[PDB]
């Protein structure tokens, strides 16, 4: 309903094979917006630490 695809989190929830097959058939694009998706690919979640950048100069 929200038009926000997230195959990785849905697969991690339950039934990963069916979710992956549906995502491949639909050809959806996952932007890794979720925190668990970022953690599974070595990225910061972005809630407490990760939503700001420290620039020296």
């Amino acid at each position: 309903v929200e038009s926000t695809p997230a195959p990785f989190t849905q697969a991690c929830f339950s039934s990963p094979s069916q979710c992956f097959l549906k995502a491949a058939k639909e050809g959806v694009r996952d932007d890794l917006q979720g925190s668990i998706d970022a953690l599974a690919w070595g990225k910061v979640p972005g809630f407490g630490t990760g939503d700001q950048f420290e620039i020296i100069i």
Partner: protein, 76 residues
């Protein structure tokens, strides 16, 4: 603008960690050191003396961002 003008705990911790990492890599300290040997103590002194030259860029949900400074923000 449109900012609370307060430095959060997460930003403070990240700044302290970055400064401690820089100090541990043989970096000169802007603030004078007297009887201090731990990088965390030096970072705390620099943060309390608001003389650390770091800039904070806060990302907004709409896509835009606002750039601040350590001296511009206040601590508590």
């Amino acid at each position: 603008r449109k900012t609370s003008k307060f430095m959060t705990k997460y930003e403070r911790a990240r700044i302290l960690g970055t400064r401690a990492l820089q100090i541990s890599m043989n970096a000169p300290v802007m603030v004078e050191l007297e009887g201090e040997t731990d990088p965390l103590e030096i970072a705390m002194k620099e943060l309390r003396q608001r003389k650390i030259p770091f800039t904070i860029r806060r990302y907004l949900p709409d896509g835009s961002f606002e750039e601040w400074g350590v001296d511009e923000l206040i601590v508590e």
